[PDB]
């Protein structure tokens, strides 16, 4: 579940919440990509949210180098399973991650069938 | 149609959206209040949103004086009518109307059974 | 800080996030009221968010009986201190809390100077 | 003024709001894409939001066929222009345009340096 391509002080964590039910979004698949040298998206890490709606251990401090990363949340499969025909195919969060500043990231996403918000971070990890 | 009290160049407008169905929240009750000297809420204007999810002609420029206002939105009757169990009793937006600031105010509300956003203002008009 | 009128399995917790800075909202004063028998708001508990943007220990399982509670977040003082003139006087969350179902509550609030969202819960506590 | 490609009864419209200043996001670049057979994104329509934060006449009913669309919003250049350091590279909305569904689509985006919401649809018109 909440795991991926690494284990460290958790430089990248994802938390998904369900705005219709008032609970975390469990079993939401997440795919992380890194912008490759040839400008394409290279697959970086993936997992699914736990019963807490969280995704941990996706990567590691060493592996998480500067770059443009795309965090893709499969919202569609999530609503489908619930009996709902959602509007979005998925929710994507694209950002630059460096060395030069903030180096631990909490990407949060609040889900509604026709809407979603996404917000980012704190500082060290907690 | 769906109007409040006074009709003319709208200094205050309300718009409500349904994030579950992806459409405007139609026929929603909104009640506006002004804090009186003894700090109690005196009814100011009221109305129900139209088929477009908007409420206009609530008040007028001469009537809308500086002060503290409360826009209360009956969110619960809305979800009940749809058969979804909601969390909130209602949504509220409390703000100070200040002359040296913008004249026109659009209070936007995006609704979910367990969550809501509220955003405000602009200046010239539509 | 994150404390109030009780200590238990945390039936009521509050977390505030800053959407402009990407961090938790620290030192945000929170006031909780309970609808009184005579239909007025009786003060119930209060505190301020910690460095994590969270508020714990506000109440206790025994003290937190069925009722309509109003959670008031002093967003205005928060932005003022930051050098910003916000739009809202505060952010309020009004809901019924029972015995008959969900009995642990996490009220979260994401803050912007002219906007704010609020969402509620999970189930047991975590 | 601020238009995309084809002009007439708008099957797709975009509106962007600034949650920091409480006004429309003016002069924002939006690029629309259609997934092609080989699953690559082919440019479909583009434009900059007007003084009202809207983008109209992007396409036309005859042109807007069923398929998967991507609306990319240049959020970063927006915050840079204001001098605020943002988190996201840009905002994206990926969705399937399906005939048996509504015809008109308004993609609404509410922006903050570290957070964004996106909501959709209605049906008849304005």
Domain boundaries, chain A: 1-126
Which technique?
Answer: X-ray
Is A114 in Cβ contact with B18 (below 8 Å)?
yes
Query: d(Cα A16, Cα A47) in Å, to the nearest integer?
Result: 13
Query: Distance from D122 to chain B by nearest Cα, in Å?
Result: 4
Instruction: Give yes or no for a contact between B106 and B120, defined as CB atoms under 8 angstroms apart.
Output: yes
D21 touching chain C per CB within 8 A: yes
| CB burial readout A4-37, b (16+ within 10 A) else e | bbbeeebbbbbbbbbbbbbbbbbebbbbbbbbee
Q: Is A119 on the interface with B (CB under 8 A)?
A: no
Strand blocks (E) in chain A = 12-18, 23-24, 29-35, 41-48, 54-55, 67-73, 88-97, 105-112, 115-120
End-to-end CA distance of chain C: 21
Residue B8 in contact with partner chain D when CB distance is under 8 A: no
CA–CA gap between residue D121 and residue D13 (Å, rounded): 9
Which positions ≥6 away from B85 have C-beta within 8 Å?
A: B79, B113
Regarding beta strands C41-48 and D115-119, do their DSSP bridges make them parallel or antiparallel, or are they unpaired?
unpaired
Q: Quick count: other Cβ atoms within 10 Å of Cβ D20?
A: 19
User: Which residue on chain D is closest to A108 by alpha carbon?
Assistant: D115
**Using CA atoms, how far apart are residues B89 and C96, in angstroms rounded to an integer?**
7
* Euclidean distance between CA atoms A116 and C52, whole angstroms: 24
The three-state secondary structure class of A1 is coil
Dig out the tokens for B36 from the structure.
């009186």
> Subunits with at least 3 CB pairs below 8 A relative to chain C?
A, B, D
A90 touches chain D (CB under 8 A): yes
B95 to chain C, minimum CA–CA distance in Å? Answer: 5
Interface residue B6 vs chain D (CB under 8 A) = no
Of D90, D123, D107, nearest in space to D54 by CA: D107
B82 Cβ under 8 Å from any chain A Cβ: no
Q: How many contacts, defined by CB atoms under 8 Å, are there between A and D? A: 50
Residue among D66, D88, D98, D113 with most chain A CBs within 10 A, to mutate:
D88
CA distance readout (Å), C30 to B27, B89, C4 = 33, 19, 10
Residue with tokens 């996490």: C106
Closest-CA distance, A16 to chain D, in angstroms, reads 14
Chains that touch A (3 or more CB pairs under 8 A): B, C, D
Q: For chain D, how are helix, strand and coil distributed in percent, rounded to 5? A: 5, 45, 50
Q: What are phi and psi of D79, to 5 degrees?
A: -65, -35
CA distance D105 to D125: 9
Q: What is the DSSP letter of B60?
A: -
Which C-chain residues 25-64 have CB contacts (< 8 A) with chain A?
52-53
Q: Do D19 and C22 touch (CB under 8 A)?
A: no
Using a CB-CB distance cutoff of 8 angstroms, which residues of chain B are in contact with residue D119?
17, 19, 22, 110
Nearest CA in chain D to B22: D121
The DSSP H or E segment spanning B29 is strand B29-35
Going B34 to B37 to B40 to B42, the CA torsion angle's sign is: negative
DSSP B71: E
CATH 2.60.40.60 fits B1-126, yes or no: no
> Distance (Å, rounded) from C-alpha A69 to C-alpha A34?
4
- Residue of chain C nearest D115, judged by CA positions: C19
Residues in chain D with CB shorter than 8 Å from the CB of C20 are 20, 84, 112-114
Coil, helix or strand at residue C48: strand
Residue A18 forms beta bridges with which residues? A23, A111
- Residue C113, min C-alpha distance to chain B (Å): 9
Q: Which residues in chain B have their CB less than 8 angstroms from residue A114's CB?
A: 18-22
Using the Cβ of B17 and the Cβ atoms of chain C, whether some distance falls under 8 Å is answered with no
Q: Is D82 helix (H, G, I), strand (E, B) or coil?
A: helix
Q: What residues contact B41, with CB distance under 8 A and at least 6 apart?
A: B33, B34, B35, B70
User: Cβ of B18 under 8 Å from any chain A Cβ?
Assistant: yes
Q: Give contacts of A20 with chain C, Cβ < 8 Å.
A: none
Nearest by CB: D113 against C20, C115, C117: C20
CB contact under 8 A, D112 and C117: no
Contacts of B12 (CB under 8 A, 6+ apart): B32, B58, B59, B64, B69, B97, B104, B105, B107
Contacts of C96 in chain B (CB under 8 A): 89
> In angstroms, what CA-CA distances link B44 with B30, B64, C93, C112, D29?
11, 9, 22, 27, 41
Bridge partners (DSSP) listed for residue C107: C14, C120
Cα D64 to chain centroid distance, Å, stands at 14
* DSSP letter, residue A44: E
- Helices (DSSP H) in chain C: which residue ranges? 75-82
């Amino acid at each position: 579940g909440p795991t991926g391509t690494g284990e460290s002080k958790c430089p990248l964590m994802v938390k998904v919440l369900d705005a219709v039910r008032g609970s975390p979004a469990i079993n939401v698949a997440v795919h992380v990509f890194r912008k490759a040298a040839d400008d394409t998206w290279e697959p970086f890490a993936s997992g699914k949210t736990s019963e807490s709606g969280e995704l941990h251990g996706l990567t590691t401090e060493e592996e998480f180098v500067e770059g443009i990363y795309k965090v893709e949340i499969d919202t569609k499969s999530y609503w489908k399973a619930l009996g709902i025909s959602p509007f979005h195919e998925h929710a994507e969060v694209v950002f630059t991650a460096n060395d030069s500043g903030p180096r631990r990231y909490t990407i949060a996403a609040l889900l509604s069938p026709y809407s979603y918000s996404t917000t980012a971070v704190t500082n060290p990890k907690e």
